[PDB]
Amino acid sequence: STIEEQAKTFLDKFNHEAEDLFYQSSLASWNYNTNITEENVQNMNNAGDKWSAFLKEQSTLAQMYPLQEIQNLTVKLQLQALQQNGSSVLSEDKSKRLNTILNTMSTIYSTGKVCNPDNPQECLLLEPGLNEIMANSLDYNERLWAWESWRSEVGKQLRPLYEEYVVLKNEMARANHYEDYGDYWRGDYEVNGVDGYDYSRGQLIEDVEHTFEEIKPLYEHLHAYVRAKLMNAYPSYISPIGCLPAHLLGDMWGRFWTNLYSLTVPFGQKPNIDVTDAMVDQAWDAQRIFKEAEKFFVSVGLPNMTQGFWENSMLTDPGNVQKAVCHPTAWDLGKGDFRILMCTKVTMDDFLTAHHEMGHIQYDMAYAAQPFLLRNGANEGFHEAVGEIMSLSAATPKHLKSIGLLSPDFQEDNETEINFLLKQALTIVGTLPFTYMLEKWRWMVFKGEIPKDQWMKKWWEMKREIVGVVEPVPHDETYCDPASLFHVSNDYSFIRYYTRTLYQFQFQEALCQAAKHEGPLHKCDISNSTEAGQKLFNMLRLGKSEPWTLALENVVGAKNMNVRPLLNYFEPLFTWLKDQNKNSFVGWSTDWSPY
Amino acid sequence: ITNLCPFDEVFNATRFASVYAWNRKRISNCVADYSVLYNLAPFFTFKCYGVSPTKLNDLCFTNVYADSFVIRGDEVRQIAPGQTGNIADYNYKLPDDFTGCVIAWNSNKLDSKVSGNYNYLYRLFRKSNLKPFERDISTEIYQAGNKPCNGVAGFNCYFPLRSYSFRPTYGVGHQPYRVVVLSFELLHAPATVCGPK
Amino acid sequence: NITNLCPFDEVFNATRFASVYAWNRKRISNCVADYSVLYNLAFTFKCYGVSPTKLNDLCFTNVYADSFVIRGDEVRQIAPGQTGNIADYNYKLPDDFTGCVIAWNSNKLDSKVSGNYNYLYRLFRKSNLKPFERDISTEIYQAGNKPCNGVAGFNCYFPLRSYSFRPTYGGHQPYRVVVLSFELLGPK
Numbered sequence: 008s009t010i011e012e013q014a015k016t017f018l019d020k021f022n023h024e025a026e027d028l029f030y031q032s033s034l035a036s037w038n039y040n041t042n043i044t045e046e047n048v049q050n051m052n053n054a055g056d057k058w059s060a061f062l063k064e065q066s067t068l069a070q071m072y073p074l075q076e077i078q079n080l081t082v083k084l085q086l087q088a089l090q091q092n093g094s095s096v097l098s099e100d101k102s103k104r105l106n107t108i109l110n111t112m113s114t115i116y117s118t119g120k121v122c123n124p125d126n127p128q129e130c131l132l133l134e135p136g137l138n139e140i141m142a143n144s145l146d147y148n149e150r151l152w153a154w155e156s157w158r159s160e161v162g163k164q165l166r167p168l169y170e171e172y173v174v175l176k177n178e179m180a181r182a183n184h185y186e187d188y189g190d191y192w193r194g195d196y197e198v199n200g201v202d203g204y205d206y207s208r209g210q211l212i213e214d215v216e217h218t219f220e221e222i223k224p225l226y227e228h229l230h231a232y233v234r235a236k237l238m239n240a241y242p243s244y245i246s247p248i249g250c251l252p253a254h255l256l257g258d259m260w261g262r263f264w265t266n267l268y269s270l271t272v273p274f275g276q277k278p279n280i281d282v283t284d285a286m287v288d289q290a291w292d293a294q295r296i297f298k299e300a301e302k303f304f305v306s307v308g309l310p311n312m313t314q315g316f317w318e319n320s321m322l323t324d325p326g327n328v329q330k331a332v333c334h335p336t337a338w339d340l341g342k343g344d345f346r347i348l349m350c351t352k353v354t355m356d357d358f359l360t361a362h363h364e365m366g367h368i369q370y371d372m373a374y375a376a377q378p379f380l381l382r383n384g385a386n387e388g389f390h391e392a393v394g395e396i397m398s399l400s401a402a403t404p405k406h407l408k409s410i411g412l413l414s415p416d417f418q419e420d421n422e423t424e425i426n427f428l429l430k431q432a433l434t435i436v437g438t439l440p441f442t443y444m445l446e447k448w449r450w451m452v453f454k455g456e457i458p459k460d461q462w463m464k465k466w467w468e469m470k471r472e473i474v475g476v477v478e479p480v481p482h483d484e485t486y487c488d489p490a491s492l493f494h495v496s497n498d499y500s501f502i503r504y505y506t507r508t509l510y511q512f513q514f515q516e517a518l519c520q521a522a523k524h525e526g527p528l529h530k531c532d533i534s535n536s537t538e539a540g541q542k543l544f545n546m547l548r549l550g551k552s553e554p555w556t557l558a559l560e561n562v563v564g565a566k567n568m569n570v571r572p573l574l575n576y577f578e579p580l581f582t583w584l585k586d587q588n589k590n591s592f593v594g595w596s597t598d599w600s601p602y
Numbered sequence: 603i604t605n606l607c608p609f610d611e612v613f614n615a616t617r618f619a620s621v622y623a624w625n626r627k628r629i630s631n632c633v634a635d636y637s638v639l640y641n642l643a644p645f646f647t648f649k650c651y652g653v654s655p656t657k658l659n660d661l662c663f664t665n666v667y668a669d670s671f672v673i674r675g676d677e678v679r680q681i682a683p684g685q686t687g688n689i690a691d692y693n694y695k696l697p698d699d700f701t702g703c704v705i706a707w708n709s710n711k712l713d714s715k716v717s718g719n720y721n722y723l724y725r726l727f728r729k730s731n732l733k734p735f736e737r738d739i740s741t742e743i744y745q746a747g748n749k750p751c752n753g754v755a756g757f758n759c760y761f762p763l764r765s766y767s768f769r770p771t772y773g774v775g776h777q778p779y780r781v782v783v784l785s786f787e788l789l790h791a792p793a794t795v796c797g798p799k
Numbered sequence: 800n801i802t803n804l805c806p807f808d809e810v811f812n813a814t815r816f817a818s819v820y821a822w823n824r825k826r827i828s829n830c831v832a833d834y835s836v837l838y839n840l841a842f843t844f845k846c847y848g849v850s851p852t853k854l855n856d857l858c859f860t861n862v863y864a865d866s867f868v869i870r871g872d873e874v875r876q877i878a879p880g881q882t883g884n885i886a887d888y889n890y891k892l893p894d895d896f897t898g899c900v901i902a903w904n905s906n907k908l909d910s911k912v913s914g915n916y917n918y919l920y921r922l923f924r925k926s927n928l929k930p931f932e933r934d935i936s937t938e939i940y941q942a943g944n945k946p947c948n949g950v951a952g953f954n955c956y957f958p959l960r961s962y963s964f965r966p967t968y969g970g971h972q973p974y975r976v977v978v979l980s981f982e983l984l985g986p987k
């Protein structure tokens with residue numbers, strides 16, 4: 008008996024036991040998330056602990072196959088998915104130190120509060136306070152206080168934790184035959200071993216940086232229109248040559264500019280399109296919304312939903328008699344069980360979120376005939392993009408007038424399309440330089456190009472160079488501004504949002520070319536397009552068995568990440584941005600400071 | 603005419619056998635009315651091989667065997683002449699010249715518990731493939747590698763039988779299915795197994 | 800007195816043959832039937848009424864050439880005075896049939912590695928077929944005492960099912976069969 012046959016036998020045992028144990032852990036997590044009681048906390052904390060212990064035990068036995076004498080690619084991919092070590096290659100006093108500083112950062116980010124500087128008893132924490140303050144207020148000093156006190160009370164408490172966390176994760180990465188911790192997060196795209204479709208870990212740097220020079224002609228015009236419209240709101244605070252302050256971007260960290268639509272509206276005479284008043288007149292509920300999403304999904308060739316999705320899922324909140332977490336999450340319990348946990352109100356945003364998560368369910372339903380260690384996306388960017396390309400097509404007025412919510416005798420001019428495209432660009436385009444800047448900062452801190460006494464001075468100049476955001480207050484090297492984000496202080500990868508944004512528009516352009524649509528890309532309805540569904544199912548069926556470089560060419564034709572479908576979507580908005588920027592200054596001067 | 607074949611004992615049983623220890627009951631010296639088994643729903647797995655279901659009550663055969671076991675819904679297609687898998691290779695093999703019908707139905711309302719029905723097992727690891735109509739009930743430890751372990755499990759030594767869970771929320775294809783396989787033989791014998799006049 | 804050759808090439812070396820449930824009827828006449836060319840194929844040449852040696856000796860009438868595709872275990876099935884699945888539901892020869900049943904194994908045209916599902920056979924039929932009767936019906940058979948109104952299920956089966964015809968069986972290999980049925984009881 009060879010080594011690969013023993014590996015296939017061990018994987019056949021693991022795919023029998025791990026599916027049952029993961030179903031137990033997912034059922035305990037579903038019973039916790041559907042009923043927040045005390046009896047479901049201990050069941051989840053026992054089932055997840057048993058599943059983690061079983062995964063650690065099977066990862067311990069998987070290292071007896073030395074990965075070099077197996078010629079099959081599927082067994083090698085499952086064994087690389089199974090032979091992960093993590094913090095097990097370090098000493099115990101460091102492996103528990105990393106956990107007790109990550110939990111310390113999590114408890115500081117969750118529990119840390121900011122008190123008002125007029126009443127020492129009145130204090131405002133994160134979720135009901137400054138998030139709603141910096142998204143509704145329009146004065147300079149209140150947003151300046153809400154930014155600076157949050158960066159002072161919470162930010163500088165995490166810098167001695169981050170200084171140890173970086174070195175501990177670098178030691179953990181170099182113990183697992185890497186060079187830095189940024190290369191470990193870049194190892195998700197490592198397809199080293201496939202003929203004609205290889206992808207190195209270091210190729211992602213000059214594949215992200217190469218697609219960024221085509222965004223900044225659109226991003227510079229977008230930022231030009233944003234601060235040209237924001238100079239009227241804040242007089243004598245924003246210069247027409249310099250950058251934008253961080254506390255005037257609509258949010259806390261400057262990620263999404265979607266809260267700037269009330270001041271940077273193109274045409275304030277007419278309101279935006281919404282069908283909430285059309286849904287509350289025809290007595291629409293959550294079941295009708297999900298059945299209309301199902302009728303949208305079966306018209307391309309995707310199969311019907313299972314009976315368990317209509318029997319065991321929670322599609323409506325039962326009120327204050329059974330406490331449940333009202334956070335929308337698509338569940339993949341395995342063994343043919345697919346559920347959706349969502350407190351669905353009668354809202355157009357809920358109508359788009361239902362399609363966005365039925366896309367995740369139909370993604371989970373496609374590779375059910377795969378092994379258990381391949382039951383995920385090919386990388387961390389396809390899963391949210393499959394959900395996003397359904398919400399792009401569900402928000403079109405063609406689908407809204409085809410399902411019955413819109414009467415056909417309405418006028419659709421360009422003054423609605425520009426207002427829709429700028430609202431789309433404030434969420435999509437405005438977050439990509441911030442994402443690329445943060446990921447390049449983390450990659451240069453992890454690999455050792457930024458020393459410990461040059462963190463904030465390089466951060467606040469790379470913000471000026473990439474994003475165009477200048478600090479309102481001079482910050483020394485005691486603050487830690489990346490530590491004020493949820494994805495950085497809780498050890499989460501952030502390159503997924505840059506890649507998913509390009510993959511979503513690549514999928515949309517591919518399905519629009521397959522759907523034979525002659526108009527613009529933002530009015531492309533792929534509802535009644537059957538020939539595109541068989542091409543999208545050729546990518547949905549794969550999962551993690553075959554490379555993502557081959558999974559792209561099955562649907563979009565290209566082999567790498569392309570940015571031209573992203574620019575083709577906002578091209579009528581790009582011509583309007585060229586038309587509107589006739590007297591403004593396209594660009595920003597990095598030497599200007601508001602203080 | 604009041605000598606009926608025991609179809610109610612191999613269909614309406616209290617519990618069915620496993621796929622590695624499948625029961626075999628000989629049916630003889632009675633008339634076989636195949637219009638009695640229409641009471642169950644859902645039912646549409648009636649792939650009769652060799653003979654036609656319309657001419658089923660026209661020919662008289664010798665001693666008829668009946669095999670009953672429990673598998674999942676996605677492995678019902680493996681019970682056919684010329685199929686490859688884990689049930690049709692290590693648990694229950696049908697011949698290529700099989701003359702009979704395969705009858706299965708959904709059993710999610712009877713063979714499911716909250717939470718766990720571990721009484722139904724299936725053989726997963728075996729050295730050689732099974733012969734047609736062979737019943738292996740051994741519990742020998744499978745030798746996955748080139749090293750003896752002397753009856754105990756561990757590295758490269760696994761138990762051949764694996765346990766089903768059978769929870770009632772297991773979608774459509776992972777639901778438990780009670781399968782009854784009828785085999786009609788044509789040996790040189792006094793033929794008595796055929797329907798009413 | 801040889802005037803023109805009979806069209807034996809279009810009924811033997813055709814592009815495609817029909818199935819056993821939808822067998823065609825090709826009538827040939829007004830020519831000289833030479834059977835010395837017919838030994839070109841490289842297995843079943845049993846002739847009834849007229850011996851195959853003296854086949855080029857008598858002057859006949861309108862010959863009906865029927866082309867169809869069956870398997871290897873059904874060459875013994877199609878015979879005058881037989882019953883079964885093909886001789887009762889698809890194609891039945893008369894009891895006083897005079898002619899030859901020319902069958903030969905091919906294993907190159909009607910056997911695909913993925914499956915050739917273009918040839919159908921009928922297994923479900925109310926009554927037995929008459930001699931020289933063709934039925935290309937497609938209605939769903941009613942097996943029980945319950946009208947389905949067109950739907951399928953137990954006691955309502957589709958009568959037309961397809962063969963597999965893999966080039967790996969022993970028997971089950973496809974046979975391209977052309978049967979001639981002359982009705983009079985010739986070169987120089």
Ligand SMILES: *[C@@H]1O[C@H](CO)[C@@H](O[C@@H]2O[C@H](CO)[C@@H](O)[C@H](O)[C@H]2NC(C)=O)[C@H](O)[C@H]1NC(C)=O
Binds near residue numbers: 614641
């Ligand atoms: C086997 O079980 C079936 C259902 O599990 C039963 O069928 C019943 O048969 C009686 C006698 O004709 C009918 O009156 C009932 O209406 C049937 N029930 C159903 C649900 O179909 C019965 O227990 C067994 N079958 C027979 C023929 O005895």
Ligand SMILES: *[C@@H]1O[C@H](CO)[C@@H](O[C@@H]2O[C@H](CO)[C@@H](O)[C@H](O)[C@H]2NC(C)=O)[C@H](O)[C@H]1NC(C)=O
Binds near residue numbers: 811812836839840
């Ligand atoms: C009809 O039958 C076969 C087609 O399968 C062909 O026979 C060929 O005939 C030519 C003419 O003499 C020979 O050179 C070839 O060797 C024959 N091929 C085989 C495989 O036997 C042809 O199309 C027709 N036969 C005749 C005799 O015309």
Ligand SMILES: *[C@@H]1O[C@H](CO)[C@@H](O)[C@H](O)[C@H]1NC(C)=O
Binds near residue numbers: 079080081082
């Ligand atoms: C590799 O594994 C897959 C899945 O088990 C199998 O289908 C394939 O035949 C294997 N390849 C080889 C060369 O054994």
Ligand SMILES: *[C@@H]1O[C@H](CO)[C@@H](O)[C@H](O)[C@H]1NC(C)=O
Binds near residue numbers: 298305311
């Ligand atoms: C599948 O979904 C469509 C869309 O609502 C519906 O009309 C149809 O009845 C569904 N089929 C099944 C079998 O549920």
Ligand SMILES: *[C@@H]1O[C@H](CO)[C@@H](O)[C@H](O)[C@H]1NC(C)=O
Binds near residue numbers: 303306409410
């Ligand atoms: C497809 O076209 C039909 C007919 O115009 C329409 O009723 C339906 O809403 C469209 N969309 C889908 C998803 O079926």
Ligand SMILES: [Cl-]
Binds near residue numbers: 261488
């Ligand atoms: Cl910041």
Ligand SMILES: [Zn+2]
Binds near residue numbers: 363364367391394
């Ligand atoms: Zn989502």
